Amino acid sequence: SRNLCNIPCSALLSSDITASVNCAKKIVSDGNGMNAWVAWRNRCKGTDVQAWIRGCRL
Amino acid sequence: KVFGRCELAAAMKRHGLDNYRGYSLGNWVCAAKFESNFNTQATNRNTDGSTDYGILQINSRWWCNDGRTP
């Protein structure tokens, strides 16, 4: 078991997503990009993802 | 905490995920949606003994320590 993000997994369950975001940045830079996330690859990749932020005030 | 679609989008953009590594914000919100349904407390155990944690379901095999993964 490797702890590449150097943090207890419980820290990724917080209402503050800072921990998850920082670790995800490390994961996506790893090599296979976002393909590392099964759901993204099977349900997001190749779809109109812009739809998920539509109507939002960014 | 169960985020709102737009609420998470704002949170992620603020943390610099929009266009991070060439992946537009919509990709991240979509991933969070289908991985954890926007719930920061989501957990899921895998057959190899590892568990996925949080809004983005990060795996315990190589990313975080949960004290029970080989």
Swiss-Prot record, chain A:
Full protein: residues contained: 90 to 147 of 147
Assigned protein family: Belongs to the glycosyl hydrolase 22 family.
Further facts: Lysozyme C is capable of both hydrolysis and transglycosylation; it also shows a slight esterase activity. It acts rapidly on both peptide-substituted and unsubstituted peptidoglycan, and slowly on chitin oligosaccharides.
The protein's role, per its UniProt record: Lysozymes have primarily a bacteriolytic function; those in tissues and body fluids are associated with the monocyte-macrophage system and enhance the activity of immunoagents. Has bacteriolytic activity against M.luteus.
Highest classification ranks of the organism: Eukaryota, Metazoa, Chordata, Craniata, Vertebrata
Subunit structure: Monomer.
Disulfide bonds: 5-23
Organism field: Gallus gallus (Chicken)
Localisation: Secreted
Tissue expression: In the egg white and polymorphonuclear leukocytes.
Gene: LYZ
Residues given in the record as substrate binding sites: 30
Protein name as annotated: Lysozyme C
